[model samples]
Target: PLPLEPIETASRDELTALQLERLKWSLRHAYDHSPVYRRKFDEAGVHPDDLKTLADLSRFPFTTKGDLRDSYPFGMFAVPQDRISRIHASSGGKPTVVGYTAADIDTWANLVARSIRAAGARRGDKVHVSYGYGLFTGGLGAHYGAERAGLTVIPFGGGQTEKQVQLIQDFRPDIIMVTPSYMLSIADEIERQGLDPVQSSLRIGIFGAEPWTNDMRVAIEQRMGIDAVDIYGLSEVMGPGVASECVETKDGPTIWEDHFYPEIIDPETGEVLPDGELGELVFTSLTKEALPIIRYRTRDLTRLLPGTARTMRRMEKITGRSDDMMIVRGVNVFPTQIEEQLLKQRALAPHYQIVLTKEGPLDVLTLNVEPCPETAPDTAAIQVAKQALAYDIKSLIGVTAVINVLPVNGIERSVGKARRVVDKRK
Candidate 1:
């Protein structure tokens, strides 16, 4: 059953007590099933059993994205192989293929369902999920959580302009779950059809999988006449429902402290920072049955938020990717992703520009690519093809980037390292 009050409503003592119990469960699971975590704890001259409370999370070594890459497939598996009901990959691109299991999936459903419910998703509400499906956790997450939360889910899955609108009309889902940028597409499609957004049935929006801002939220809410909720999550920790904004108040995202213990750390030095301190947010999954991770360094930057939800603490909106890594939908991507896509299609030109922007409630990613240096090619055809390539990239990275195919030497190149992402959001 959903809790009667927000996590922030819990007394500090009660929250601490609940967290201590869950933390021990997760630590024990990690120590037993995964040799990777066990070895790390052992090497640090400690046992998972030694850590008694959330504070003891600091005693354990911090996990990194690089570690997930090093483990690859089942190397990080903390549960028996037969026990893993389902497996999903994080799609880190090239070398890093991180897989998560069913217990992890259940953890996802519970916390995610809570986030949805926290955002005022009462029973019988229609939740329209538009995040891309297949392999990516964002779609399946809402699918499961919406089911668990007693909502009729309209699993619209990603793009399809007319169909998306048709379903919103036909299904009449009260809640829309998607990346914040997709709101612009929805509004565009709605207007193209000569429809008013305010007349749309969308009452609440749970948009995540990208770094967003208050300005973006205001714009989306104003355009769609929906209460925009900022949901937070990463593929490494459990995808788009790790924690989310309590719609009761849009101060910050509430951390699902039940499933995962939250920490803020100096990203460079691994020093644990305090609440309200702006630094990299790290998480330790305390209740995950399949893979209980400890001190997993989430390179995403945000400050710890306080007094939002009663039990689960809150974290400020993600401002920037650590080192401009371009964290699109919890997937740690670099500009190299677009570079690889463009070059693979032989649409090459050393001249390219990647523009990542934030307008109101969410992120807008765009890229301008110059076609390969060769004999004169048809500009219009290339532009059309480039636009197609941009959609392909949007499918790949889940971030729509404008692929502007320029002519040979269209942009001046530097002799040294090329600057990748031109982030106006900064």
Candidate 2:
């Protein structure tokens, strides 16, 4: 494999020194150009210059989704609109719009290029980008990065699975960038169309834009014969280039700390947590020019792991978002827990959903999963599978729930992000 960027391999002391320098400049950039930062710093009784060390960043106020909403559209832009060369927005009533200068775009592209290279992709390899484009950042974010890496990019934004399989077979690309669930759909389609996915031309898959479990990764890799790596980012900050997992070490996505500082904090009390402690993930943009986010709460729950292939610390694969956690019968459960448990059964299909309904005092939880097509249709067989899964959930996740193992294709397949949770509470 080719060597990574110097920043990726930089010593901790070197990386920290660089982060501190850029961090100060970013603080001043935001304070001087954005009214939101000015107001927040003033109200918090702190100034940009007051930050003497990385720990001193806590002296400044934290930014949240609500803050972005309050300052919707261009209110968060530090630089004038005339200076911003590009802007991407997230969907909402009060959308969070991110602006970037020409230089910012270049930096973003280079970071994405670094991410692709981290996945063991080379300069002449062809990359099939299926992440949605336009207002969503995944498509163009990956497009620019693959182009920057000198790889041929096929801009096949999401949807049209039949065509996706067609082009993949026709073009014989070396890489595919998409969501894990969509990749599963493609694999299923390939098999449906009498094609072998394991013999396809795709050698690697860079998947993100949603939270997925490692078991799903194993399933995709085994079926499609591609090495799948996880990427992490959001529209409020940069995009898919914010962080990426190395193929050599798939433990977690490493934060590009030279440009973005990472932190874990107590979701309830807003206190910082040490490494290996599960908490809400936070980030501070160190070199971003147009949108200099201070301490932005990401709401994603994960812990920091020591870096393996890179010097930067790795944020464990996101288990679940704090907001998406379902508190059923006083026990908190995540859809991923169900997904992981489903894969444990040899005769169960990967597609599953968590349905929450309000029947009485406590919210009732139901697990609807698809059984493998070869499984028996006898009532006794269904009951055996259901009881086994119920026990699995009870023993592993410490929760008991109803399990419905439907026939194959009973659970709808997703073309984009898989709809895992169906909340029907009134």
Candidate 3:
């Protein structure tokens, strides 16, 4: 159950009214406080007052990553420096800085707590958060939420895979908040300790921080014996609680649109696409004070789906980032596409990497997949499985790729962020 049922289960009309009211104020607030937004609106020949209807948001110029960088440390903040309560930044020079007021922090915590509950967690349930802490926003965001939900929070930052697994066995956490990739490492360690993950203490896992396929989710659920749910967020858009997938439905993440407005737009033309159309996703912060973002380009590719467990709209599972898309031999291919095809065969493991290299004038794509140790033993059987996958790759993924079915645990595993793609092109 949501902390605020009236808002979470509000009628569609009610949600729309709330959004329109908040959108108007947010637009005016950003335009007045942030000089960057004011200049943008002025240059676009638009004003906050011009937003008489929600559709008028189209008139405002979109915000890009470069815009966030240009603002540097404090230019994007709506409140003065003294009023800022906390700050987080993305990696790199001129780090994409985001600030939060005291009120913003409270709202963020509540939303994340609500997300935890939605993912089948409960009060008094021990929550083990393994996302990296410090400036990353993953650990602290989850820490506050689990606390707010009345659950015991184990602030186990990332890494220490052996320790993470041991603690889970000892403390008996009911829930784990971590990336799906890292959870695999923990799963490996569980078996290393001669423990059956399928009967472990972990009942629910809220996984995100990177794109994953439904195929991967199934694998994680069965191996780890947990109800795996997707929790989506970015530091720019209020950390790791902007949206979450309900464990009951497990279809897509239901965006808390009352505080954050979402729009899908054509990546190239910037025209907002209608609901249910696949396009680049964009967001507008409706309730933020310290930092106000207007139509921030998220570059995440998804379509707005009808809500299942809540009145808010759900974003179709993020297939891949627009910037992460790769074209191999005139065919558009995404890592998730390769993953989905890989899961079709039971003899192969979920671990695989896409290697991109420029061979002569052509871009070559090679998939290194691991075989289930107990399933494929003989070379003849392995060759047949490899050929089957190669054919599946060409037929389903729309690309010809070399399939190398490596030995069990042959692919490199990561304890933190797993590298799924390796590019060697000049």
Candidate 4:
């Protein structure tokens, strides 16, 4: 809406008022600028004049993936291709592609830079970005962001260990941006090469583009000698700076509201939920000069973490992707909740997998957990852990699960992202 406040001196009430006021403006902007939004809002019988308050936003229709796909190839864009700068993609089940324009590119870069700064990277420093380049948001997001932050950018761009390490040694980067799972794998690579990850030139890490836990962060920091900050974003939310943990305090990630307006909506109904309530995340592109998407449903689950940041709002880590959610014994279960409980068990490693399968017309919930290496518990310990874990799953997720305690290194690791869950159900 209006130029974003510094997010340094504002209060929660002030932030909300700004968001509502801007959202009201955004609605009118959409109707006047976007054919796609205008048609959809008009068909939903919503007039821009009617959306006086943020709460009235629900009276307008919800935007879903279907709309984007239906209006593919810039059909939904409010601006022409001349203003477009870059292109990005959304991963469909079969590897389909969606692209964003140049103005979209700058929006992502600015937001990602904000994310890096939020995670405590300052100017004039060297930052190593290991997200995959080209087609993937992770690498490019970090690249442009580090550059925008006035940091010397390393487009490590995934793969090639000797060279990757060579740059780390020569450049002596101040920050390492990578996926958590990849960070672990990279540490292993460093060790394999007789190099110590902890003694490397990394001071901070912006880790995301995958699911991870605090346990993982601890393990990463201990292994790599870096402070790991969690980051969350997607090609859908305009990439990695969509939300991130501030380096000042990694307690939670702050939503980059200036460029991307944030909202929590009832997952199934598409109804807007109040701040702090857990639901699907919705984003409205507030500053993208080209291809501004109005109220795009992200399908990611998150809650606004109240009382965290004095100015910008902080969001709890995204808990689960709606489509990735598992159902066990007719109860809805998010594997992340299981991961949280399993971590609390103090017997498992940060890694886990939720296996779902059909069992004689019934469903089976099996948790494949890696035992925490230090605990070194025997098979008997697993039995004790299982009882506690199964009960916890049932109580928290309202689902029953058979916990399979796998030894460390039992689960398969990807060359990039870790293979966390396996579903065999038909």
Candidate 5:
């Protein structure tokens, strides 16, 4: 078994105490350093000092992506520009820029290092990182953490799928860090080269930057012959190392409570919920200097569970983001829910797209899916699979979908994050 940091095995009381102390300092840092935070707290009639207990954190105003957008560029930064050692932003949409002071960067590296360790990566292991580099945080964040973890870094940013597979064959990396969708794309390429992905040297895969289903996990693990684990984080909440799944227990992503404090709140009411209850996940940066986020609403929907691998709490694999929720004819649905049902069919492959269209007065959802290579050529099998999938979607999701079973490679492969939903109604 891999060795653990002392804090990883710490008692619950000890972790809570540490969180309370850092939470207090982080609140004061954000309030005193950033005018935006100060105005939010002041307008909400809450002071940093008002947080006498951890529960008092709920009294403070919650920060949102909109808040970051309102304070675009450097408006949300708590530290001076000169002190910032690096910056990263969200890709697509209006960019929400985040900065890290030198110390903050160091802290991020250490936290990511801890996350890598938790994911069962060891020293001297070669890590092939396929997350996009440059402005996006996924690439650099994993790069620094792999280096910090004493692993040999591949630094293979997104794209060049053929080269990615070639390097995997030539370099023989022990670990691969990429979004699950892109990893599947790589796996497909490996097979295209007449090479079995299961024969590759990669033993473990740390997948994140997008929500994936456990069904997808089984498929990736079976196809690639590797242990797949989830790493959770957003660019706003310190990139991709805020939480990670332990190889020993693949139940959920363990939130790094020492650096980031996690909370579950009723999304509509903003009221804090007890552990094990499903709701929106919220985070507060405990030790960050450049940007101390307090009660930042992640918009991710999941329940908090007691940690099994570590003392820190674990978040249930995200059901779906609130923003991704689609209301079709009074039925609420998410792409992930569709993904879960689609993966149940043995003839179908994981690659699919959810296209929404309008016909007359009703909204129509079309699931453009691809068949497993072996099943693609058979029209009879495809028809049967299509009807079965549509039936499952209606029975399980309570919404009828027009299922279009396309040929293999019908859906465009994702180079980075998979674009699952295409809204034509808009």
Candidate 6:
């Protein structure tokens, strides 16, 4: 492995000291420059001076996606438009536009490079970036990071699965950065073209932009014959390098604490929870200039663990988001819980969907799944597997589901984030 950055190996006390210094500057920078932060801080009767210790950060109000959405276009930006070097937006309706100063972009690239190194990348390695480019941050974010890390970058943005596999064969990249689900699709396409995914040149995968499970990681790693690591970030907080998994441990995404401070909060009460407790993940950007995000709630459910491979703490693998939780008969369920259960069955394929519908006054959940291609013709075995899955869900998740085993390729696949839940209750 390449030598880690000095800060990555710094003592916790040293990391904390640097964070405090940067946190003070960031808070003051936002309050003095952005009217939104100024008004919010004043309204809360809090000042930058109030933050004497990191724990005092809880005194500040939490920033949610609503805050960014309400601010929209450029309202939350700390710097003037001319000083902003680049802009990127979230996918879907009324997307939040996030900006970066020239310096901010440089900082982002450096962090991403740090993330790449953490994922076991070395100088001169080739990286195939499959994330979608433009408006979205994934593609360019990975591209610049790979380049910054002294790697040859194949900037093949998302889609064109066949051609993506073709290029992977021709280019023989050592690493791939893309969503976990799309990576599976690429593997399927590779198989379709009579190429062994396990024989491909790629050795490591950095996956994120959506919450995925360790079970999914195991599936991907075994299928593609590569080490799969998770990279975490949001556009509002500077894209995919906010944190990343260290390949040496493969435990969780280690928060780059020198640049970003993390806090776990009670999702309902918004009270900060002690580390190692499960709650919503929040971030405060300490070095961002164009837009300084303070206590931005990510809505992803996870716990903060002490760092393993690095001095920086790690956030446990996120299995669910607050928004993805579904309520049925007073029982709460996340699609990932279902995924974990279904993947246990050897007869089933990883591709499946959770659909919700209403029956009279009651809510009903149906799992539309498919059998593995090799076992698709074994109807009797598929029936047995279906029953076992339903029983496991009821016993474990406390929700009974109607399991429908379909033919191969029964569910539509997404080239980006896979739509796991289809709620028809509305």
User: Native-vs-model 1 lDDT?
Assistant: 0.73
| Candidate 2, 195-311: lDDT as tens digits | 989999999999998888999899888989999999989877799979999998898998888889988889898899889999998999988888899899999999999889899
Alpha carbon lDDT at 161, candidate 5:
95
How many backbone clashes can be found in candidate 1? 13
RMSD of each: 10.8, 1.6, 1.7, 4.1, 1.1, 1.1
- For residues 280-381, could you state the per-residue lDDT of candidate 5 as single tens digits? 999999999998898899999999999898998899999999777888888988899999988888788889899998988888999999888888787798
- Backbone clashes counted, model 3: 0
- Per-candidate Cα lDDT values, in order, are 0.73, 0.87, 0.87, 0.74, 0.91, 0.91
Each candidate's TM vs. the true structure? Answer: 0.75, 0.96, 0.96, 0.84, 0.98, 0.98
Error of 4 at 305 (Å): 2.8
Mark the regions of model 4 whose C-alpha exceeds 4 Å error after superposition.
Answer: 1-25, 93-101, 161-170, 341-349, 366-410
Checking candidate 6 for backbone clashes, the offending pairs are: none
How high a TM-score does candidate 3 get? 0.96
In Å, residue 387's CA in model 4 sits off its true spot by: 8.1
Please provide, for model 6 over 27-120, each residue's C-alpha lDDT reduced to its tens digit, 9 standing for 90 to 100.
9999998878998899999999999999899999878888888888899989888999999998784998899999999988999999999999
State the lDDT of candidate 4 residue by residue for 1-426, as single tens digits.
Answer: 112237644666776777777776667777887788889888988788997766676676777777767776677666666655666765443332345666567767777777777777765679888888887778888999888777888787777756777788889988888877767656756766777788998889888887676766777788788888988886755778878887667777787775677778888778778887999888886665445567788887888875454366777877778767776666766666776787667666566677888879788888887765556557677677878988987787778788887767787655456666688987
| Candidate 5, residue 18: lDDT | 87
Q: Using lDDT as the measure, name the better of candidate 3 and candidate 6.
A: 6
Cα lDDT, model 3, residue 397: 74
Per-residue accuracy of model 1 over 296-377 as CA lDDT, tens digit each? 8888888887755455678887766666577654566665456546644443443456777776766777676665434237
